[PDB]
Subunit: 316 residues, 6 copies
């Protein structure tokens, strides 16, 4: 009624905001010349699919402040210039809270996040890097990348958790279920999960069902050489990388909802990302919880540096 049409006008004005801002970043990259791919940040400030704490809703603006901190320089480790738009642009945040606040259901909210990602991909040669937000957001992002490209992607999923519960606590959009949604829908072929150390019988059974390659930290000593020399995406249209910050031991990343000892070092993660051979078509950095971070924002710098090194990898 009056309501459904009111909701459509807020949704439409939200998509228009992303569309106009993408257009300006696309024109800016196309004007400078030569880029084959150019990382564009899209923020999805959503936390209500979280099982424990909703703090990731507040992450994307903290991440951006950390990327540009006066304490850092603008060069990535392998020497890309983050001030160059062909390396990194930013189309801003999906207005999630404003959409929820007007009574929009999750089916439609997640549809708006997909469309938001399509708006970036439709500006050549931008490729999306999504700032979460809780891990529920990887389903509408991966769906949007798969649909746009016209086939399943191979995924590298860095996570303490496999996020492959059929329906965690009745919520099909649970942050603990988004890789079940992705695999059910035929949006991914290979799913490599690395850093896994919190998994139950359902996680293992769902892993076998979907053909997932689950690397547990209890075999990391033996798996490290293979994980520091990954080659992904041959025979599919691209590779997507999803990083839950909780792939890192809490010593490196305390600013997470799920503290799970025995994880990767920051340098372990960069060894995997730097050495990965892959046509990276998209990526996300999720589950940064600023409310659980240190008083000085150490996990914000962790999330920012992951974003920066993913941008170097995506942009070419």
């Amino acid at each position: 009624s009056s309501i459904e049409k009111g909701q459509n006008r807020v949704i439409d004005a939200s998509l228009t905001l992303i569309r106009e801002r993408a257009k300006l970043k696309g024109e800016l990259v196309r004007l400078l010349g030569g880029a084959k791919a150019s990382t564009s940040l899209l923020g999805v400030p959503l936390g209500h699919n979280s099982s424990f704490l909703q703090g990731p809703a507040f992450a994307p603006p903290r991440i951006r402040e950390a990327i540009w901190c006066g304490s850092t320089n603008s060069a990535t480790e392998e020497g890309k210039e983050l001030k160059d738009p062909r390396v990194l642009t930013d189309v801003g945040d999906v207005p999630v809270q404003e959409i929820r606040d007007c009574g929009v259901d999750d089916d439609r909210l997640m549809n708006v996040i997909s469309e938001s990602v399509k708006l970036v991909m439709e500006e050549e040669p931008l490729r999306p890097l999504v700032l979460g937000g809780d891990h529920s957001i990887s389903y509408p992002v991966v769906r949007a990348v798969s649909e746009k490209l016209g086939g399943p992607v191979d995924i590298l999923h860095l996570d303490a958790h496999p996020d492959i519960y059929d329906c965690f606590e009745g919520n099909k959009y649970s942050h603990a279920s988004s890789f079940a949604r992705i695999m059910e829908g035929g949006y991914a072929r290979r799913l490599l999960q690395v850093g896994i150390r919190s998994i139950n019988q359902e996680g293992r059974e769902q892993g076998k069902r979907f053909g997932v390659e689950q690397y547990e930290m209890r075999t990391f000593s033996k798996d490290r050489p293979m994980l520091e020399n990954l080659k992904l995406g041959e025979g599919v249209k691209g590779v997507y990388i999803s990083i839950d910050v909780d792939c890192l031991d809490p010593a490196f990343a305390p600013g997470v909802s799920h503290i799970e000892p025995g994880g990767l070092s920051f340098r372990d993660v960069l060894n995997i990302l730097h050495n990965l051979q892959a046509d990276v078509v998209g990526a996300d950095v999720v589950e940064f919880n600023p409310q659980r971070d240190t008083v000085d924002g150490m996990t914000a710098m962790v999330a920012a540096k992951l974003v920066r090194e993913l941008a170097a990898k995506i942009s070419k």
Copy 2:
């Protein structure tokens, strides 16, 4: 100039979104009936006019979380029910960071902010409670309130500092120059400044020159009775309440950019607000810096409860 016209498509859509949200809230309040005035939150995540720290840019979403925290109930001290839209609605945040990012200068930003305030006012019978954001925003909110209403207002300005510097560090939009801009444009008649304990010889000269009633904490013992029995707005369009969070002793409100000992207690602030007779037309809660808050968000709960009590006074 393809970008200069493109800036306008970002602004148009930015304001479109505020209006589309404003109408839905408008409609729900008019459906319910009986409201003369209805507090509607409008966030202004702007901190780049700050002299020391830009942390208030992150405040409005934290304030909103604290209002609805499971630890609290939805009753105000007086007994007003915050779940009733006649009492409180929220039109969300102005996308200041997106606007800044598409290269728009401060003139047009502050005008977009003024226009956004006007969009809420044009939806009867909503009255704007702006969540700052640094002090800089009061000037465009007040100008927009003063323009819409057709003439000057009187201001209750609760703050440790007086913020009437002519031009502070060469920025005319400085959070320290905001009330100099307001007085200069005759948007205010009586400016009552309360909780003042950080003032310089320029602060006093400008206060006399604009005929400002500056109450210093030095005389609070004698002043309390007068301060706890205030009446304002007779002969004017209305009364604007600008509450900088540092009016409170840092013991109550650590989460600010300027720690200034010898402040008000939270109860002192409620004594003043509960007792003040005013036609309140507009109110801001500013300078709340989450990056300076306690790990448990004590200042977020302070900001939230001042918003709640301010909304129980504005709503009628």
Copy 3:
């Protein structure tokens, strides 16, 4: 079968026997020194599971004891009593609440154990119980136990941001938000003065009006302060019980709470009320200190400890 309830009973009985043996030694110490009319004895009830928001008060009583004896402090109360005199303060320790919960004991029988533990202290004359919470749910079994033992209602001074008189908060009758409904329902309290109230809803006020509760809100503290720094309670009944939720204090003074509620009393405001109260105090509690929410140096532990020290000087005589 009923092998379950009987096994639970053996654990409950052993739990109560341990409080009995501890209370006896403290009793015998106070009697052997001689001259006490009343001797504050601490009983901890490390219980958090009736909270609506955070269960951290389950951990408070050990932290409060540490703060009472911190080497940064001396052993004198403000009005000059010696806390090292067992006649002024003793400690019978903690009800083993978690271990009773862990063997499947329901809340009715668990609250019965708390009551029975309070009686066991009262039955070593001249001990009077000062209970360390724990969440505010515990005041119900404590006040029930004191009233039943003294054989009549008491007057209660209740210092709290919240009135805690929901008929059944979230369906739990033992909710920390319902303990003073449970108390007034049972006729264990004649007068109930609630002081520091600044978070209350229509049901709060309707339940206030129903049970004859005197609700002093902070929006009228300027006016009410003279009368509140001059209380007299308990005349014509068995005595006065003082319940202090640490959230009566503004969070500036007491951040270590589950419910941050700006606009509360100063610590000095609470000692003015306590010091000047005229009352034969038969029991007290300090509840809702949440160590998990405290500063890293334990400021709220020192607050809860000093409230305990000033209540002990008041109860001991």
Copy 4:
């Protein structure tokens, strides 16, 4: 007089042991009624910190550990796949009421004897095996003594710690947390003592290791020693293996909530590489020296302590 004092204390001690015995009896009956278990980890808390040389914070640890084991952020499966809500995998007989026993004047010899008897009460309920939550490292002595006396012979011990804890009498306290492994080696309770993660030791510690034939692995040789330490075999021919983990075996990056910050320690993953690969019939274990008052505001060291307890439980239970 002053001998009647000892009789009142004995009433508190007996009431304390009776309470542990009754809790242990329900846990043993539950495990046995479910059937099939050969061994079932049962937690025993010993909230003792007064033998500490710097901070007594470990007295507050056991309840914080239990909370973290059941934290709603976590799931109930161990890394290897054991279900912690199965009583045959984990039960909990609660805490020894240490503070109350100290508070009625009981001397340290009698208090440590209570800790020993409490451990035996768990072991007496077949098939429970004790996993002790400290508490400072002093408690390892009475625990290891009870396990050895009850099994009727020596155990091999894996001791994970920044410190060897083998001073004869640290600051005149024979029950010092820095002397508990001297107490253990003097009593004949151990065949092998392997000390892993050592990085704070002096000549007295090295001399005491030689005197008792302790095998001391220092972090300065961890590059060389790692393969050996990640393939340990212990307890063949004796009553089994006891594992004592001082949380300060971990670099303080991983475990800040300790009284003794000693940079250059093991990663959490390094410790699980050692535990997971250890071949051992583990007859008991402890997790000690978690200091909640030195932890982060979010309890990161509580979650470290809890995950060590959970992984040990998965190893003890079978």
Copy 5:
């Protein structure tokens, strides 16, 4: 024993260092003059007479950083300019840890503290404001001011504690015996102890024995009107103010070694200082413990603003 020539030239070089900087500060003040009194800061970074924590050793450099923090203005509540050397100069810190390390005894160390205070006074028109350090430093500072002026002073002593034990734990220089030492020496006519709330039998007896006026917080309701209208020094050499930061409720000043609930507000102390009628000849601000302070240095700001307000009272 060539340690004597060393100990001696270490001491001489320490004293030289203060003489030289006093000479420069004096010259700068008279250079453009018309000042009767000018406040000069002297740090005594001494904490080893503390009974619990020694953290006050580190305070004086932290107080200086807070006085000149970019978040603050250079004007005092009354309106004096701290950049004006006539109002405030700074002669740096007595090298206490350096004198300690060469094996010098507490008797001689405290003499150095005394000598160092006289160096500031010997340089007209400088008046010493000492940044502690623990409360032991007040004995030698008051000794120096009294001997230099040749007569006793009236002393306003703000503290949770009376610091008047005969020999706390066997140390006659205990921070808990400074006022026993002062009273035994005849340096004070009147001693007013304000904010007392941790006192035992020995505290009351020593008080009665020395004629000390002990204001306990439990009578502050009745004493406030009187404490906010003091008059001291009339007839004797002048007024010394000693301020233990723990005079303030820990809500206002958590950065102390002794947390003692139920203290004064920051505005309470300012009401006492602003209305104190007195010729103030010296003052100290002691027992700030930076190791117990909040992460953002609230108590540092609290000690700095006491120093700034004291300097506005002392300078003229």
Copy 6:
């Protein structure tokens, strides 16, 4: 002009204080007999050459406290006894803030630091270990060591940053330029920078210009065997080791002005220091920022243990 006269009397007393203390330590070392080399701590509390925060100004006293903490023992990892003066003495802190305050320029302040180092070196057989302070101090320290020994040294520089900017933000004494100053003076033959992970085009170009061996964390897997087997100083005057605490991953060393994820573990650094073959003639531990440390001083312990293990290596 008598200002200039004043400054020289202050510098002289400042040097006179280091001379006399170093005399007492040399005499003590010489009287115990047998030492070839004896580590002597010299503190340089200087932060104003920092680009981001001046916290390291406060570091040296907090390091000393950590070295002697009652939670620790006095043996190093390889068994040296820190209470033996032949293993460790301390000549205390260059009075940096007193020299700045009397208006001395950075040229002369840096020369004072050089002179303070030589005063240690002139007391046989002390060798200097300097506690920073920000990285700017390495230049005047190495310049003094090289001038004193009459030739160049090899340097091991442990840092996240190369600090080799020509003129970072206009300041030739920038903490980000001190190795450009060192390499321009010919004070060093080899400069091995280890743990580098924040470097731009200028850092790389300047590295090539001065022949710097730049070991980046992105090749640490490959490089680790060679870095745990270093031999330096053969055919030159010896080896100087500079340790920026931010060489460590912020997981281990959060108390730094520059959070840079993906660094060395503590054990990594000790594997390098313990296996290094070198005649170490001097060392520094710089850029510990206590205002960014944990509430319990974790980074203070890290800095203390680096100092302790360097002392074991320097003393012989």
